[PDB]
Symmetry: D2
Subunit: 392 residues, 4 copies
């Protein structure tokens, strides 16, 4: 099958690519893959484990391999051995020039960039290129997935984002102030009939205009924002306090990392996107809302090794306060990368079983799962098993 | 309703009584009571939150209040005012001489004991004494619940544990060598047709002879070993790794604690009763069984304040190792006590609804749940609920 | 000896009074007291363990006992019995009205205050009101220690803070814009010719004009800012890395607390008095400044129980990164309170031995020790000992 | 200079050798070297950073590179490029074959082992062989350091370890029962007049006989048992409770690791060279002896990454109990390796200043420093600094 990756030269993206190839050349195991669980025996019928990649980028790198080496140099998140073995495959994967429209202050920090707006094109022209790019690539087994830098919170317009009609008038009128890259990509994907996933907190296909378009074309989509670490933990074990009828009075989650993302998610301008994101999460599991703090800080030396420190303060019998601490030490790309392959496969699966619009039941992969209040990891996993089983 | 507590001047038992009476006196909240959770609404008409207490002990104190105060002095795990407000009630609660039969070398650590065997009695007699004690206290709404100190591994005997007939020939013969307190209390409870629960890892009613007795007498029973702290975290958190097809290469649980259960369990004699519990435990959620060390150690100054340390080492995508740490800081009688009153009510409910034998569906409370492979905190919770909804 | 506490009704200050009295009455041990270490045997020659208290406050409560009861109610940081036994002496301690001048947006967070400038008074009357308050109380064995709420960064002025001439003019020409309470309190202790110590990040006697005052007056003074918890471990543990020629690539401190202080410092403009610190702390022990972050966050449920998480990333042989984690769990007032007395005893000694100006040698007590580069806790202790031995 | 290494194919040893060649090759920096700290400027007039390696082993590996690589495969503790860079240097390093006498059950773990007593040799000629291997290799500027696997407790012979005569009688008389490998190589070193150091808890040169010899021959020597991680933290952190007049009421150290030594110290009978050695550590810094458990468990997946969990429970003002937790995560070979070279450098310096016998002043490097009580890292460092200055 074919995967088109928005932000194709990033760590998550290339680790997923490196990984797809290593597994297919049979020199890496299938650990990490949700689609490779016993319960999903059968899915290779509808979406074999086989991947061809391309994607969009704004960064000035030569091909996927050069990108993967750069990330590997600073993180050694996998055996050098593995990288050298896929050097050739990844070298033949060259990204096409993207758009960074409305991507914020922090885009400097990617180093040297090249954009479609940088060539001085109209919105129509840019949309049109992105479309061309993917279509020349796309077959009937193609999915599009966004893994590009988190955008700020969009310049939200009722006119231009409230309806598909409105969104297209935005394109046609060349009204760039209203568009964000993620919208354009997602539009293009749904526009060409291609399943789309948003792995980021950027708006992507979340706006009503793109949900409308998704529904009308008959195209499945999912998101948003992959639940890969500390949040997976939170949503896996907050429910333990509800089951035991204990009152969580405070929850602290403090996470640190370096690399392109943490260095941008720093300034509380762009820091806003993951501070609402971890307590209304809690009320939807406990049915009340403890005092919750949620923070990410820059910490250069850690690079992609996002580390998180959680404290849970809770009352038990006779209201006695008690304490729970945990530390999460993982490489972000390693926990994310496989989910991109899982999502690609589940989405193709959904396409072929005729699913249209938002795939509620894929909540399991995300922190802002669209169209659902099912947040508790356990219920989510059951939901995904059961959605898979019923359609199979 | 009535609750006969085996080990009744224990900190769990006393905390239970203190909290039952405080809640009833309207002077403490109802946090921690699983039977108080919304899904369990209506349980009141079969098992109201109304409690009377008696029990067996081998410790020499005057009454439950002195026991309670003794633990409270060293522990201060509830407000002094609650202690005073419940004084006259627990002063009215007087345990009856029990049996230390085959309870391990470290029964020396409780210090001052008088026991039924200690009178030079026989099995036939001990048993009639234990029964008379209970029959004395019992109505149609009495449950017997074991929270006595953890017994060593019992001497094995298929003749005497294999079947009711064998056990009863054991009693008849006074073959004390193959008998243990937990068993005799269990036998007594079932021979009077009262529901029975085993909050401890002692064999209790779990031997085949006593399951048969329960079946034949038509009484519900449940256990074993209440799942209160760290093990709750383990059966809640381990499934996460399962859901993300991650391979745990190592699980470490080290816990320190003081108080009575500290010294005894740490040594050799009774430490062999919660080590074989946590890789077969893991095997039943991971589906495989990783290097798993499990250990408890004496640490005086901590008293009843069980502190556990856990390190989980797991591979994700591409074979890449990552680490997860947690620290559980709780007062053990606090997580334990409410579950005693929950086990009570739920047992009275089962009895009223015609349940007999093991109630598998009360696994949610136990570290070694009988007759179930369901160990996942979430699967056990759904199972508890469904059970309830299906008999309600 | 007499001790005059600015911020008299605060937890830190009330706990010191409770401890002072409790130790005098013979109902508490002498743990926590640097002045009570065997090196300082001899000290009671000049600074015995006896204490009379007085103080300024701005909150309306009857006496130091109500002040202490409030704090204990929320915190339960010592036995009910300790409180009860000192009820008498502490009811005999009534704080006199002070100034809340320029003390931040968080002065709103203290509930109901009444203040000297609240009577619409002038800098000159306010100062002499302060001095007359301390002057009745004060004898030839009286010290003044500041434990008031953290002020924001002072309004910068080199005309008014650079010289005592400029400071007295500020007072003469009533320029409240350049004056904060902590400076006014300090000016008064020192004009009245009394030892002064500042246990807070506020300027206090550290403005140049005030050091000038203390020198010209020949008065000893110590400060600033108690090093009671997290920062103690930092100044004790950092050296280890320097001793083994390892390179700290990064250090994080993340503290949470509630209670009055957590409230006040939760505002951004009152938080700033603890961000620009433990970078320049680190370079003063390591000789290079690693990437450091320090943060305090409001966390209501913890009350005065500060809990700090630190992470240190560091390079050793062949530049391999390694990791060190720590969690600090203490009641702030408990660790603060003893030093208050310790400082009082040490200041009164200093004075008696004719010491004048900044007592560099009390660096051991402080996060921002004045006039000194000795930050290393061990180096700091040794100085405190030799300074003392050299005067004994 | 020349360093002869006992256990030359170890991870500590081969990492030291890998590191030394990298630094000389100028392809890695000098992080981790105590001797490269400023206070020692000039140490190299007497002890340049210049190293030639030889040693004793029982494992069958071709040369020092095969060994380094084998460890590297499993640990990836330094860069694959460093290994290639130094391959040819390490390949010229062939270990000469030594003795495994009375190193107990934990020598079956190592693999294919060949020894001197394996040839059915007598103590006389095993020693002779050992001195012949070394003398051959050694010049006026050679050191012997022990980094071999930890022995079980030596067999007790007061006659044979009480005095030089005794010891050499043991040899002439072939009393194999009473010697072990540490003792033999140490004897062998001091006979040839080379300085000796013992990085292991093995007795080595610390028996009265062998220090008798060192004096007699005017040879300097140091040990025992490198202080590399957890214990370092402890000897650094415990004095903070002393300085602050607090009482430690319990200390827990729980360390897990895999690889050779983790295998070795798992079996209970070898775990006992670090059982008595950590309350007597605390005492020597604290004044009193608090409850203190120190434990090490096998954890295969960690390989050489010794992780440790510490919990200090402590009383402060008014007897209030507080908690401190830390987690050390390092690679034991990285923390150790530099100290091997440092130790060699200080030893040559010592030799060259006429120092003889136990050099107590090098305690800084050790867990059980010979002939000294100074345990506190801070004090040890100063002592190390001062000693060097006194002989500079
Ligand atoms: N486990 C995880 O890492 C995790 C978890 C949840 C969500 N996410 C989301 O996934 C994203 C993955 O990024 P990463 O971790 O690989 O960091 P990264 O810095 O390696 O990736 C971002 C990449 O996208 C490119 N890009 C940015 N804007 C673009 C645009 N407008 N058009 C085309 N390309 C663009 C950048 O040049 C960069 O190559 C994160 O930024 C976050 O939004 C990640
Ligand atoms: N979190 C928890 O506290 C928890 C969790 C799981 C299981 N348990 C079970 O609870 C038991 C006791 O816990 P506790 O916290 O009350 O400790 P505890 O030692 O204070 O209580 C046990 C009490 O039972 C008495 N006793 C011992 N043997 C007896 C016997 N044969 N007959 C009658 N009384 C006897 C003892 O004198 C003591 O007073 C443990 O043995 C354990 O098996 C507790
Ligand atoms: N271990 C520690 O708690 C520690 C460590 C370092 C620094 N400090 C400093 O000590 C201060 C007090 O600590 P606390 O725990 O008692 O908190 P707290 O808020 O309970 O104490 C502050 C008290 O001072 C009073 N006050 C405020 N402004 C005043 C003014 N201008 N004049 C006279 N009185 C005033 C307030 O009414 C309050 O009662 C902290 O804000 C901090 O600046 C404490
Ligand atoms: N941070 C640390 O790793 C550190 C700290 C303190 C103490 N130590 C000590 O250092 C030793 C080495 O550590 P390691 O992790 O490199 O273990 P390792 O097993 O990899 O190295 C020890 C080597 O010595 C060899 N050996 C065993 N007995 C011998 C004998 N009698 N003669 C010659 N060679 C022999 C073994 O074959 C092995 O290769 C430990 O056993 C321990 O006593 C190490
Ligand atoms: K990432
Ligand atoms: K207990
Ligand atoms: K770690």
């Amino acid at each position: 099958m074919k995967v088109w990756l928005v932000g194709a030269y990033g760590i998550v993206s290339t680790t997923a690519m490196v990984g797809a190839r290593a597994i297919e050349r049979g020199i890496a195991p299938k650990i990490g893959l949700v689609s490779e669980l016993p319960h999903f025996e059968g899915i290779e019928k509808y979406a074999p484990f086989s991947f061809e990649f391309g994607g969009h980028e704004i960064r000035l790198l030569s091909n996927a391999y050069e990108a993967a080496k750069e990330h590997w140099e600073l993180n050694r998140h996998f055996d050098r051995e593995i990288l050298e073995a896929v050097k050739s495959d990844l070298e033949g994967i060259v990204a096409r020039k993207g758009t960074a429209l409305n991507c914020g202050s922090g885009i400097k920090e990617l180093g040297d960039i090249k954009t479609l707006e940088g060539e001085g094109l109209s919105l129509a022209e840019m949309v049109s290129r992105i479309e061309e790019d993917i279509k020349s690539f796309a077959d009937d087994e193609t999915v599009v997935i966004n893994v590009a830098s988190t955008e700020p919170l969009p310049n939200y317009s009722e006119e231009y984002h409230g309806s598909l009609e409105g969104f297209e008038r935005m394109i046609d009128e060349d009204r760039k102030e209203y568009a964000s890259a993620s919208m354009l990509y997602a539009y293009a994907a749904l526009k060409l009939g291609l399943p789309y996933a948003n792995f980021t907190p950027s708006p992507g296909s979340a706006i009503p205009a793109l949900k409308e378009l998704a529904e009308k074309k008959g195209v499945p989509h999912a998101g948003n924002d992959g639940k890969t670490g500390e949040t997976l933990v939170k949503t896996t074990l907050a429910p333990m306090f509800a089951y035991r009828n204990m009152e969580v009075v405070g929850w602290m989650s403090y996470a640190i990392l370096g690399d392109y993302d943490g260095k941008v998610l720093s300034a509380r301008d762009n820091k806003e996107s993951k501070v609402l994101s971890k307590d209304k999460v809690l009320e939807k599991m406990l049915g009340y809302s403890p005092y919750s703090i949620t923070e990410i800080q820059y910490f250069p030396s850690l690079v992609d090794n996002k580390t998180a420190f959680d404290f849970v303060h809770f009352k038990g019998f006779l209201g006695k306060l008690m304490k729970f601490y945990f530390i999460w030490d993982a490489i972000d790309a390693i926990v994310a990368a496989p989910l991109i392959l899982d999502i690609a496969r589940f989405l193709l699966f959904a396409k072929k079983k005729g699913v249209k619009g938002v795939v509620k039941e894929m909540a399991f992969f995300f922190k802002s799962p669209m169209d659902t209040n099912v947040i508790n990891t356990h219920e989510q996993f059951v939901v995904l098993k059961e959605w898979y089983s019923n359609l199979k």
